Amino acid sequence: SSISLKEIIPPQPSTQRNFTTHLSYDPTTNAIAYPCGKSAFVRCLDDGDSKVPPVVQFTGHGSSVVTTVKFSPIKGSQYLCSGDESGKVIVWGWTFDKESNSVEVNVKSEFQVLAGPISDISWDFEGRRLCVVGEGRDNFGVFISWDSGNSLGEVSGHSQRINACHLKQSRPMRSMTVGDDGSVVFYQGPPFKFSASDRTHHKQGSFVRDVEFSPDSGEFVITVGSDRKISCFDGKSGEFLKYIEDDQEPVQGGIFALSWLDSQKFATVGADATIRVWDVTTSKCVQKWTLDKQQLGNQQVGVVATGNGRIISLSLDGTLNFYELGHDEVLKTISGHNKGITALTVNPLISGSYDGRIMEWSSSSMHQDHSNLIVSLDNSKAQEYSSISWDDTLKVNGITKHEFGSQPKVASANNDGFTAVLTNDDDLLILQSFTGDIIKSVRLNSPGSAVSLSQNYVAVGLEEGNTIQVFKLSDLEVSFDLKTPLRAKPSYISISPSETYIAAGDVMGKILLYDLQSREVKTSRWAFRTSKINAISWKPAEEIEEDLVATGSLDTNIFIYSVKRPMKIIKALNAHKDGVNNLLWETPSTLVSSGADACIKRWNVV
Ligand SMILES: [Zn+2]
């Protein structure tokens, strides 16, 4: 008996309005790396099976939000380096096993380099030296050896935050840091030391957001930022050569990032929802790609060349845009969440995160209709969905059909188009999932922290005495208490599909199973988790007697308990960094999970 990882749907890159998201591409593994939440990710652009794992997730930054992920230049080195807001940098390496289909990640070195958050990282072409940069009190960046951490130079010339850096990928080594107040500094080195400074080519007070030396011998260095200027320096002397401008292509917005396709062409991307391709020599824009400027989400917050003219653009809305030099049309788009997932539906698969974004995977549709946490999702009605959010509304296919007078704490929908909601004002409401109408309601005697709506019952977890009261859907005036309360505040309740039992767990990790009818505990034998329970889902039949029950807790684990054999536990550890939020059975043998880490995972239950 087991559970094995069947598929991983990774989140989109982390984003912030007015801020660049530095991406990284690795030719060898044909994959890109990017930060999202508290984990670093590497996603293989390779569809057709390959020896490269689809996804690699590094959780080593613990509680610190990851800011940047960079591939080591050494082909096949499978090493990467990432930084976080706490100012810590980590060099880690992964491992894969196409067989077990298991990915291992082992840290190799960690360094507390900055007081504040790290903004960018860059390796030397030997994959042994690092330019780390960002913000601090006295230090705005450092130059250190990847294994020891001993200083290999000194970041200087900046008084304000450093935004990006880059190491000329060839000898004689040279470096570049760039940041706030139009500051651009050049270094020389192996022992990188201040060489030259510049505060005349980028407007004072502006933000220079990215810098990058041309591939091969790096004959040039280019910096970009909010003043819409593209400055071109010489890769050796660092002398300003010229601005890259084309009369037929005025830059109408601040630039966020750049990436060289080869030694002559490089891409830029910015607030004017445009992806432009330039030729350093002619200073002419050779190719342009646009998106509707009228939509905030189209601003281009990142970019990275992936070889042979292929370019990947990052939208403020987290979308990944694939383009190719010579082809005026966008090749394909990839959307998804970049915020913890809080609501889940199956057959068809739909997900919602705590920012209110909803994802329809059956049509690759991404919605930004709600503007806050998605409490629940209901797809019972054919080709439609009903969503409830902390933005106090109930929407049906992105359209508002109900405005709550009181915020919806938690909710639960059955299969007959009904949704039971518990509000901040301590009310239990029963809505018609698809019209938004409240057909019946009742004031609860105490705040409620959990709901489970079956075909005929409504089980509510009550904070006062952490008891479970069961309501009759058809008549809220009738109800009964289960003989035994919980240990601590109820966190999640799941009524049996046949309404025989009721599984309810608490914020401490206890999960009691009751017999609904007799309202008596049927077993408290299921193993204590020592962590908040966030999800419980009954496995359906392929016997027919309800037995296996999947559950998830803040501790990141998935525990599939058994009614018949309370001592037997099938488990999957580290399912989702920082906790499992949702759990569903889309197939009698397949589980689907969502986590605080904005990941969605499918599992094969053997
Ligand atoms: Zn929509």
Coordinates of C-alpha atoms and ligand atoms in Angstrom, one line a residue:
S1 CA 0.0 0.0 0.0
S2 CA 1.4 3.4 -0.9
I3 CA 1.1 6.8 -2.4
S4 CA 3.5 7.9 -5.1
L5 CA 3.9 11.4 -6.7
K6 CA 2.1 11.2 -10.1
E7 CA 2.4 14.9 -11.3
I8 CA 3.4 18.3 -10.1
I9 CA 1.8 21.5 -11.3
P10 CA 4.4 24.2 -10.1
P11 CA 3.4 27.8 -9.4
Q12 CA 4.2 30.7 -11.6
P13 CA 7.1 33.0 -10.8
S14 CA 6.7 35.4 -7.8
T15 CA 5.8 38.9 -8.8
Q16 CA 5.5 42.5 -7.5
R17 CA 4.2 45.6 -9.3
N18 CA 7.1 48.0 -10.0
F19 CA 9.7 45.3 -9.3
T20 CA 11.8 43.1 -11.5
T21 CA 11.8 39.3 -11.2
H22 CA 15.2 37.9 -12.3
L23 CA 14.8 34.7 -14.2
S24 CA 17.5 32.1 -15.1
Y25 CA 17.7 29.6 -17.9
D26 CA 19.9 26.6 -18.3
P27 CA 20.6 25.4 -21.9
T28 CA 21.7 21.9 -20.9
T29 CA 18.6 20.9 -19.0
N30 CA 16.4 23.3 -21.0
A31 CA 14.8 24.6 -17.9
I32 CA 14.2 27.9 -16.2
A33 CA 14.5 28.7 -12.5
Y34 CA 12.5 31.2 -10.5
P35 CA 11.3 32.0 -7.0
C36 CA 7.8 31.7 -5.7
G37 CA 6.9 32.2 -2.0
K38 CA 9.4 30.4 0.2
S39 CA 10.7 27.9 -2.4
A40 CA 12.9 28.0 -5.4
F41 CA 11.8 26.2 -8.6
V42 CA 13.3 24.8 -11.7
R43 CA 10.8 23.9 -14.4
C44 CA 11.8 21.9 -17.5
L45 CA 10.6 23.4 -20.7
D46 CA 10.8 19.8 -22.0
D47 CA 7.4 18.3 -22.7
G48 CA 8.3 15.0 -24.2
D49 CA 9.8 12.8 -21.5
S50 CA 13.4 13.5 -20.7
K51 CA 16.0 12.6 -18.1
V52 CA 15.3 16.0 -16.6
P53 CA 12.6 16.0 -13.9
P54 CA 9.6 18.2 -14.8
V55 CA 10.0 20.1 -11.5
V56 CA 12.5 20.6 -8.8
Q57 CA 11.5 22.5 -5.6
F58 CA 14.0 23.6 -3.0
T59 CA 12.5 24.5 0.4
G60 CA 15.8 25.3 2.2
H61 CA 15.0 28.9 2.9
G62 CA 12.5 27.9 5.6
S63 CA 10.6 31.0 6.7
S64 CA 12.3 33.4 4.4
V65 CA 10.7 34.4 1.1
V66 CA 13.0 33.4 -1.8
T67 CA 14.0 36.4 -4.0
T68 CA 16.2 34.9 -6.8
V69 CA 17.3 31.6 -8.3
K70 CA 20.4 31.1 -10.5
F71 CA 21.8 28.2 -12.4
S72 CA 25.5 27.4 -12.1
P73 CA 27.2 27.9 -15.5
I74 CA 28.8 24.4 -15.4
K75 CA 27.0 22.2 -17.8
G76 CA 25.3 19.3 -16.0
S77 CA 26.5 20.6 -12.6
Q78 CA 22.9 20.5 -11.4
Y79 CA 23.8 23.1 -8.9
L80 CA 21.9 26.3 -8.2
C81 CA 22.2 29.3 -5.9
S82 CA 19.3 31.2 -4.3
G83 CA 18.8 34.1 -1.9
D84 CA 16.0 35.2 0.4
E85 CA 14.7 38.4 2.1
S86 CA 16.5 37.4 5.3
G87 CA 19.7 38.1 3.5
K88 CA 20.8 34.4 3.3
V89 CA 22.3 32.7 0.3
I90 CA 22.3 29.0 -0.4
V91 CA 24.2 26.8 -2.9
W92 CA 22.2 23.6 -3.3
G93 CA 22.1 20.7 -5.8
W94 CA 19.4 18.4 -6.9
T95 CA 19.2 14.7 -7.9
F96 CA 16.6 12.8 -9.9
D97 CA 15.5 9.2 -10.2
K98 CA 13.2 8.7 -13.2
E99 CA 12.4 5.4 -11.6
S100 CA 11.2 6.3 -8.1
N101 CA 10.4 9.5 -9.9
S102 CA 11.9 11.1 -6.8
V103 CA 13.9 14.4 -6.6
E104 CA 16.5 14.9 -3.9
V105 CA 17.8 18.3 -2.9
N106 CA 20.9 18.7 -0.8
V107 CA 22.3 21.9 0.5
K108 CA 26.0 22.4 0.0
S109 CA 26.6 25.8 1.5
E110 CA 24.8 28.7 3.2
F111 CA 25.9 32.2 4.0
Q112 CA 24.3 35.2 5.9
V113 CA 25.6 37.8 3.5
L114 CA 23.2 40.8 3.9
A115 CA 21.4 42.5 6.7
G116 CA 18.4 43.0 4.4
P117 CA 16.9 41.1 1.4
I118 CA 18.9 39.8 -1.5
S119 CA 18.0 41.2 -4.9
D120 CA 20.2 39.4 -7.3
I121 CA 22.9 36.7 -7.6
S122 CA 25.4 36.0 -10.3
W123 CA 28.0 33.2 -10.8
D124 CA 31.3 33.5 -12.6
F125 CA 31.8 31.3 -15.6
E126 CA 33.7 28.8 -13.5
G127 CA 30.8 28.3 -11.2
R128 CA 33.0 28.9 -8.2
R129 CA 32.5 32.6 -7.4
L130 CA 29.4 34.6 -6.5
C131 CA 28.3 38.2 -6.7
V132 CA 25.5 38.5 -4.2
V133 CA 23.6 41.7 -3.9
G134 CA 20.7 43.6 -2.5
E135 CA 20.2 45.9 0.5
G136 CA 21.8 46.1 4.0
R137 CA 22.9 48.7 6.6
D138 CA 26.6 48.9 5.7
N139 CA 26.8 46.2 2.9
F140 CA 24.7 46.3 -0.2
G141 CA 26.4 43.2 -1.6
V142 CA 29.4 40.9 -1.6
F143 CA 31.8 38.8 -3.7
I144 CA 32.4 35.4 -2.2
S145 CA 33.6 31.9 -3.0
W146 CA 30.8 29.4 -3.4
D147 CA 32.2 26.8 -1.0
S148 CA 34.0 28.8 1.7
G149 CA 32.3 32.2 1.6
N150 CA 35.5 34.1 1.9
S151 CA 35.5 37.6 0.4
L152 CA 36.8 37.7 -3.2
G153 CA 36.2 41.4 -3.5
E154 CA 34.2 44.4 -2.3
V155 CA 30.9 45.8 -3.4
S156 CA 31.2 49.6 -3.5
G157 CA 29.9 52.8 -5.0
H158 CA 26.3 52.3 -3.9
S159 CA 24.6 54.1 -1.0
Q160 CA 21.1 52.8 -2.0
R161 CA 19.7 49.3 -2.6
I162 CA 21.5 47.3 -5.4
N163 CA 19.0 45.8 -7.8
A164 CA 21.0 43.6 -10.1
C165 CA 24.6 42.3 -10.8
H166 CA 26.4 40.3 -13.4
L167 CA 29.7 38.8 -13.8
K168 CA 31.3 39.0 -17.3
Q169 CA 31.3 35.3 -18.1
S170 CA 34.9 35.3 -19.3
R171 CA 38.4 36.5 -18.4
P172 CA 39.7 39.1 -17.7
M173 CA 36.8 38.9 -15.2
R174 CA 34.7 42.1 -14.7
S175 CA 31.5 42.8 -12.8
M176 CA 28.6 45.2 -12.7
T177 CA 26.2 46.1 -9.9
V178 CA 23.4 48.5 -10.5
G179 CA 20.6 50.0 -8.4
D180 CA 18.6 52.9 -7.0
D181 CA 19.4 56.6 -7.8
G182 CA 20.7 55.8 -11.3
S183 CA 23.8 54.2 -9.8
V184 CA 26.0 51.9 -12.0
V185 CA 29.3 50.6 -10.8
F186 CA 32.1 48.7 -12.7
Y187 CA 34.6 46.3 -11.1
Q188 CA 37.7 44.5 -12.2
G189 CA 38.8 41.5 -11.1
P190 CA 39.5 38.2 -9.6
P191 CA 39.7 40.3 -6.4
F192 CA 36.8 42.3 -7.6
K193 CA 37.3 45.9 -6.6
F194 CA 35.7 49.2 -7.5
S195 CA 37.0 50.2 -10.9
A196 CA 34.7 52.9 -12.2
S197 CA 31.4 54.5 -11.3
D198 CA 28.7 56.2 -13.3
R199 CA 25.8 58.6 -12.3
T200 CA 25.3 60.6 -15.5
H201 CA 23.8 58.2 -18.0
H202 CA 20.8 57.1 -15.9
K203 CA 18.6 59.8 -14.3
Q204 CA 19.3 60.4 -10.7
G205 CA 16.6 58.9 -8.5
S206 CA 15.7 56.4 -11.2
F207 CA 15.9 52.6 -10.7
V208 CA 18.4 50.8 -12.8
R209 CA 16.9 47.3 -12.6
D210 CA 19.0 44.9 -14.6
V211 CA 22.4 44.5 -16.1
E212 CA 24.0 41.9 -18.3
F213 CA 27.2 41.3 -20.2
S214 CA 26.9 40.0 -23.7
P215 CA 27.7 36.2 -24.1
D216 CA 31.0 34.8 -25.2
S217 CA 33.7 37.5 -24.6
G218 CA 31.3 40.0 -23.2
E219 CA 32.4 42.9 -25.5
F220 CA 29.5 45.0 -24.0
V221 CA 27.6 45.5 -20.9
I222 CA 24.1 46.9 -20.8
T223 CA 22.0 48.4 -18.0
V224 CA 18.3 49.2 -17.9
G225 CA 15.8 50.8 -15.6
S226 CA 12.8 53.1 -14.9
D227 CA 14.2 56.0 -17.0
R228 CA 13.5 53.9 -20.1
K229 CA 17.2 54.2 -21.0
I230 CA 19.3 51.4 -22.4
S231 CA 23.0 52.3 -21.7
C232 CA 25.7 50.4 -23.6
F233 CA 29.1 50.1 -22.0
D234 CA 32.3 48.3 -23.1
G235 CA 32.8 45.0 -21.4
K236 CA 36.5 45.5 -20.6
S237 CA 37.0 49.2 -19.9
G238 CA 33.4 49.8 -18.7
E239 CA 33.4 53.1 -20.6
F240 CA 30.0 54.2 -21.7
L241 CA 29.7 53.6 -25.4
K242 CA 26.2 54.8 -26.4
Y243 CA 22.5 54.6 -25.7
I244 CA 20.6 52.0 -27.6
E245 CA 17.8 53.8 -29.4
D246 CA 15.9 53.5 -32.6
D247 CA 13.8 56.3 -33.9
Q248 CA 11.1 53.9 -35.0
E249 CA 10.9 52.3 -31.5
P250 CA 10.5 54.7 -28.6
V251 CA 10.5 53.0 -25.3
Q252 CA 7.2 54.1 -23.7
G253 CA 7.6 52.6 -20.2
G254 CA 10.1 51.8 -17.5
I255 CA 12.3 48.8 -18.3
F256 CA 12.5 45.9 -15.8
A257 CA 14.8 43.4 -17.4
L258 CA 17.1 42.3 -20.3
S259 CA 18.6 39.1 -21.6
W260 CA 21.1 38.4 -24.4
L261 CA 20.0 35.9 -27.1
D262 CA 23.6 35.8 -28.4
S263 CA 26.6 38.1 -28.7
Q264 CA 24.7 40.6 -30.8
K265 CA 21.0 40.5 -29.9
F266 CA 19.3 41.1 -26.6
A267 CA 15.7 41.5 -25.4
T268 CA 14.2 44.1 -23.1
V269 CA 10.8 44.1 -21.4
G270 CA 8.9 46.6 -19.3
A271 CA 5.8 48.4 -18.1
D272 CA 4.7 49.2 -21.7
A273 CA 3.6 45.6 -22.1
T274 CA 6.2 45.2 -24.8
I275 CA 9.0 42.7 -25.5
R276 CA 11.6 44.3 -27.8
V277 CA 14.6 42.7 -29.5
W278 CA 17.7 44.9 -30.1
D279 CA 20.9 44.6 -32.1
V280 CA 23.7 46.3 -30.2
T281 CA 25.6 47.1 -33.4
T282 CA 22.9 48.9 -35.3
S283 CA 21.0 50.0 -32.2
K284 CA 17.8 49.1 -34.1
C285 CA 14.9 47.2 -32.6
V286 CA 14.8 44.1 -34.8
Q287 CA 11.6 42.6 -33.4
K288 CA 8.7 43.7 -31.2
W289 CA 5.8 41.9 -29.4
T290 CA 3.0 43.7 -27.7
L291 CA 0.2 42.9 -25.3
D292 CA -2.9 45.0 -24.4
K293 CA -1.5 48.0 -22.5
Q294 CA -4.9 48.6 -21.0
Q295 CA -4.5 45.7 -18.6
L296 CA -2.2 46.0 -15.6
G297 CA -1.4 42.3 -15.7
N298 CA 0.4 42.6 -19.1
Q299 CA 3.3 44.6 -17.8
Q300 CA 6.5 42.6 -18.4
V301 CA 8.3 42.0 -15.2
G302 CA 11.0 39.6 -16.4
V303 CA 12.6 38.0 -19.3
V304 CA 15.2 35.3 -20.3
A305 CA 16.5 34.1 -23.6
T306 CA 16.4 30.3 -24.0
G307 CA 18.5 29.8 -27.0
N308 CA 18.2 29.9 -30.8
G309 CA 16.1 33.0 -30.8
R310 CA 13.7 31.7 -28.2
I311 CA 12.7 34.2 -25.5
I312 CA 10.5 33.9 -22.4
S313 CA 8.7 36.9 -21.0
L314 CA 7.1 37.2 -17.5
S315 CA 3.9 39.2 -17.0
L316 CA 3.0 41.0 -13.8
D317 CA 0.1 38.6 -13.5
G318 CA 2.7 35.8 -13.3
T319 CA 2.0 34.5 -16.8
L320 CA 4.9 33.1 -18.8
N321 CA 5.0 34.3 -22.5
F322 CA 6.9 32.3 -25.1
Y323 CA 8.3 34.1 -28.1
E324 CA 10.7 33.3 -30.9
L325 CA 12.8 35.7 -33.0
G326 CA 11.4 35.9 -36.5
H327 CA 7.8 34.9 -35.6
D328 CA 5.5 37.9 -34.9
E329 CA 3.0 35.8 -33.0
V330 CA 3.2 34.6 -29.4
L331 CA 3.9 30.9 -29.5
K332 CA 2.2 30.0 -26.3
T333 CA 1.3 31.2 -22.8
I334 CA 1.5 29.5 -19.4
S335 CA -0.6 30.7 -16.5
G336 CA -1.1 29.7 -12.9
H337 CA -1.0 30.7 -9.3
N338 CA 1.9 32.4 -7.4
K339 CA 0.0 32.5 -4.1
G340 CA -0.9 29.8 -1.7
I341 CA -3.8 27.6 -2.8
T342 CA -6.9 27.7 -0.6
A343 CA -9.7 26.1 -2.6
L344 CA -9.9 23.0 -4.7
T345 CA -12.4 21.2 -7.0
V346 CA -12.1 18.1 -9.1
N347 CA -13.5 16.7 -12.3
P348 CA -13.0 19.3 -13.7
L349 CA -10.0 20.5 -11.8
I350 CA -10.2 24.1 -10.5
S351 CA -8.1 25.9 -8.0
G352 CA -8.2 29.2 -6.1
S353 CA -5.4 30.9 -4.1
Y354 CA -5.5 33.5 -1.2
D355 CA -5.3 36.4 -3.7
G356 CA -8.6 35.4 -5.2
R357 CA -7.1 34.1 -8.4
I358 CA -8.9 31.0 -9.8
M359 CA -7.5 28.5 -12.3
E360 CA -9.6 26.5 -14.7
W361 CA -7.2 23.7 -15.8
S362 CA -9.6 22.1 -18.3
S363 CA -9.4 25.3 -20.4
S364 CA -6.2 26.9 -19.2
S365 CA -8.3 29.9 -18.1
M366 CA -6.9 32.2 -15.4
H367 CA -9.2 34.5 -13.5
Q368 CA -8.5 37.6 -11.3
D369 CA -12.2 38.3 -10.6
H370 CA -12.0 38.0 -6.8
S371 CA -9.5 40.1 -5.0
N372 CA -9.0 38.1 -1.9
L373 CA -8.8 34.5 -0.5
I374 CA -11.0 31.9 -2.2
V375 CA -12.9 30.2 0.6
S376 CA -14.6 27.6 -1.6
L377 CA -15.3 26.3 -5.1
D378 CA -18.3 24.3 -6.3
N379 CA -18.4 22.7 -9.8
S380 CA -21.4 20.5 -9.3
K381 CA -23.4 22.3 -12.1
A382 CA -22.2 21.2 -15.6
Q383 CA -19.6 23.6 -17.1
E384 CA -19.9 26.2 -14.4
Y385 CA -18.5 27.0 -11.0
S386 CA -19.5 28.9 -7.9
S387 CA -16.8 30.6 -5.8
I388 CA -16.9 32.4 -2.4
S389 CA -14.2 34.8 -1.3
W390 CA -13.0 37.0 1.6
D391 CA -13.8 39.9 -0.7
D392 CA -17.2 39.3 0.6
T393 CA -18.8 38.1 -2.6
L394 CA -20.1 34.9 -4.2
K395 CA -19.4 34.8 -7.9
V396 CA -20.7 32.4 -10.6
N397 CA -18.4 32.2 -13.5
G398 CA -16.6 35.3 -12.5
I399 CA -19.9 37.2 -12.0
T400 CA -21.1 38.4 -8.6
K401 CA -24.4 36.9 -7.5
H402 CA -24.2 37.7 -3.8
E403 CA -22.7 40.3 -1.5
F404 CA -22.2 39.2 2.1
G405 CA -23.1 41.4 4.9
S406 CA -20.6 39.5 7.0
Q407 CA -17.3 38.0 5.9
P408 CA -17.4 34.3 5.0
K409 CA -15.0 32.5 7.4
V410 CA -15.2 29.1 5.8
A411 CA -17.7 27.3 3.5
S412 CA -18.7 23.9 2.2
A413 CA -20.7 22.8 -0.8
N414 CA -22.4 19.5 -1.6
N415 CA -23.5 18.1 -5.0
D416 CA -27.0 19.5 -5.2
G417 CA -26.1 23.2 -5.9
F418 CA -26.0 24.2 -2.2
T419 CA -23.4 25.9 -0.1
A420 CA -23.2 26.2 3.6
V421 CA -21.4 29.3 4.8
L422 CA -20.3 30.4 8.3
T423 CA -19.8 34.1 8.8
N424 CA -17.7 36.3 11.0
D425 CA -20.9 37.3 12.7
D426 CA -21.5 33.7 13.7
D427 CA -24.2 32.9 11.2
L428 CA -24.8 29.6 9.3
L429 CA -26.1 30.4 5.8
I430 CA -27.3 28.0 3.2
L431 CA -27.0 29.4 -0.3
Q432 CA -28.0 28.1 -3.8
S433 CA -24.5 27.9 -5.1
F434 CA -25.5 29.1 -8.6
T435 CA -28.0 32.0 -7.9
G436 CA -26.3 33.3 -4.8
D437 CA -29.6 33.3 -2.9
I438 CA -29.7 32.6 0.8
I439 CA -32.7 30.2 1.3
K440 CA -32.2 29.6 5.0
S441 CA -30.0 30.6 7.9
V442 CA -29.5 30.4 11.7
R443 CA -27.6 32.3 14.3
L444 CA -25.0 30.1 15.9
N445 CA -24.6 30.0 19.7
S446 CA -20.8 30.4 19.3
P447 CA -18.3 31.3 16.5
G448 CA -17.9 28.4 14.1
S449 CA -14.6 27.3 12.7
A450 CA -15.5 24.5 10.3
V451 CA -18.3 23.2 8.0
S452 CA -19.1 20.1 6.1
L453 CA -22.2 20.0 3.9
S454 CA -23.5 16.6 2.9
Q455 CA -26.8 15.8 1.1
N456 CA -28.9 16.1 4.2
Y457 CA -26.7 17.3 7.0
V458 CA -24.7 20.3 8.1
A459 CA -21.9 19.6 10.6
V460 CA -20.5 22.7 12.3
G461 CA -17.4 22.9 14.5
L462 CA -18.1 25.2 17.4
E463 CA -15.3 27.2 19.1
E464 CA -17.1 27.2 22.5
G465 CA -16.3 23.8 23.9
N466 CA -15.0 22.7 20.5
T467 CA -18.1 20.7 19.9
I468 CA -19.7 19.4 16.7
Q469 CA -23.4 20.2 16.2
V470 CA -25.2 18.5 13.3
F471 CA -27.9 20.3 11.4
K472 CA -30.7 19.0 9.2
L473 CA -30.3 20.7 5.8
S474 CA -34.1 20.7 5.3
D475 CA -34.7 22.3 8.7
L476 CA -32.1 24.2 10.5
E477 CA -34.3 24.2 13.6
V478 CA -33.4 20.6 14.1
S479 CA -29.9 19.5 15.2
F480 CA -27.9 17.3 17.5
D481 CA -24.6 17.3 19.3
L482 CA -22.0 14.5 18.9
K483 CA -21.4 12.9 22.2
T484 CA -17.7 13.8 22.4
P485 CA -16.2 17.3 21.7
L486 CA -12.7 17.8 20.2
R487 CA -9.4 18.6 22.0
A488 CA -8.8 22.1 20.5
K489 CA -10.6 24.4 18.1
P490 CA -12.1 22.3 15.2
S491 CA -10.2 22.9 12.0
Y492 CA -11.9 20.7 9.4
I493 CA -14.9 18.3 9.2
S494 CA -15.8 15.9 6.5
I495 CA -19.1 14.0 6.5
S496 CA -19.0 10.5 5.0
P497 CA -20.2 10.3 1.4
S498 CA -23.0 8.0 2.6
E499 CA -23.4 10.1 5.7
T500 CA -22.5 7.2 8.0
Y501 CA -19.5 8.8 9.6
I502 CA -18.1 12.2 10.3
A503 CA -14.3 12.9 10.4
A504 CA -13.2 16.0 12.3
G505 CA -9.8 17.2 13.2
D506 CA -8.5 20.1 15.3
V507 CA -5.7 22.7 15.2
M508 CA -3.6 20.5 17.5
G509 CA -3.6 17.5 15.2
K510 CA -6.3 15.2 16.6
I511 CA -8.8 13.6 14.3
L512 CA -11.8 11.8 15.8
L513 CA -14.2 9.6 13.7
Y514 CA -17.8 9.5 14.8
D515 CA -20.8 7.4 13.8
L516 CA -23.2 10.2 12.6
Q517 CA -26.4 8.4 13.7
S518 CA -25.4 7.4 17.3
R519 CA -23.3 10.6 17.5
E520 CA -20.7 8.5 19.3
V521 CA -16.9 8.3 18.7
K522 CA -16.1 5.2 16.5
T523 CA -12.4 5.5 17.1
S524 CA -9.8 8.0 18.3
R525 CA -7.2 5.5 17.3
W526 CA -6.0 7.4 14.3
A527 CA -2.5 8.8 15.0
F528 CA -2.1 12.2 16.5
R529 CA -0.4 14.6 14.0
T530 CA 0.8 17.3 16.4
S531 CA -0.2 19.9 13.8
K532 CA -3.3 21.7 12.5
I533 CA -5.6 19.6 10.3
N534 CA -6.6 21.4 7.1
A535 CA -8.1 18.7 4.9
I536 CA -10.0 15.4 5.0
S537 CA -11.4 13.6 2.0
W538 CA -13.1 10.2 1.9
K539 CA -11.9 7.8 -0.7
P540 CA -14.6 6.5 -3.1
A541 CA -15.1 2.9 -4.2
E542 CA -13.8 1.5 -7.5
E543 CA -16.8 -4.1 -0.7
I544 CA -18.1 -0.5 -1.3
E545 CA -17.8 0.1 2.5
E546 CA -16.2 3.4 3.4
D547 CA -12.7 2.8 4.7
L548 CA -9.8 4.9 3.5
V549 CA -9.7 8.6 4.5
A550 CA -7.1 11.1 3.2
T551 CA -6.0 14.0 5.4
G552 CA -3.6 16.9 5.3
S553 CA -2.0 19.0 8.1
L554 CA 0.0 22.1 8.5
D555 CA 3.0 19.8 9.0
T556 CA 3.2 19.3 5.2
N557 CA 2.0 15.7 5.3
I558 CA -0.7 13.6 3.8
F559 CA -2.0 10.8 6.0
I560 CA -4.5 8.3 4.6
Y561 CA -6.2 6.7 7.6
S562 CA -8.4 3.7 7.8
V563 CA -11.8 3.1 9.5
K564 CA -11.4 -0.7 9.4
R565 CA -7.7 -0.6 10.3
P566 CA -7.0 2.6 12.4
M567 CA -3.4 1.5 13.0
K568 CA -2.6 1.3 9.3
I569 CA -1.5 4.6 7.8
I570 CA -0.4 5.3 4.2
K571 CA 1.6 8.4 4.0
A572 CA 3.4 11.0 1.9
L573 CA 5.8 13.4 3.6
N574 CA 6.7 16.9 2.6
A575 CA 3.8 17.0 0.2
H576 CA 3.6 20.8 0.3
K577 CA 6.0 23.2 2.0
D578 CA 4.3 25.0 4.9
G579 CA 1.2 22.7 4.9
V580 CA -1.4 20.8 2.9
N581 CA -4.4 23.1 2.4
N582 CA -6.8 21.0 0.2
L583 CA -7.3 17.3 -0.7
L584 CA -9.5 15.6 -3.2
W585 CA -10.0 12.2 -5.0
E586 CA -10.4 12.9 -8.7
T587 CA -10.2 9.1 -9.2
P588 CA -10.7 6.2 -6.9
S589 CA -7.0 5.7 -7.1
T590 CA -5.8 9.2 -7.5
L591 CA -5.4 12.0 -5.0
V592 CA -5.0 15.7 -5.8
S593 CA -3.5 18.1 -3.3
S594 CA -2.8 21.8 -3.0
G595 CA -0.5 23.5 -0.6
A596 CA 0.6 26.7 1.1
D597 CA 3.5 26.5 -1.5
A598 CA 1.0 27.2 -4.3
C599 CA 1.6 23.7 -5.8
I600 CA -1.0 21.3 -7.0
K601 CA -0.1 17.6 -6.9
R602 CA -1.7 14.4 -8.2
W603 CA -0.9 11.1 -6.4
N604 CA -1.3 7.5 -7.3
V605 CA -2.7 5.6 -4.3
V606 CA -1.6 2.0 -4.6
Ligands
ZN1 ZN -13.0 35.5 -14.8

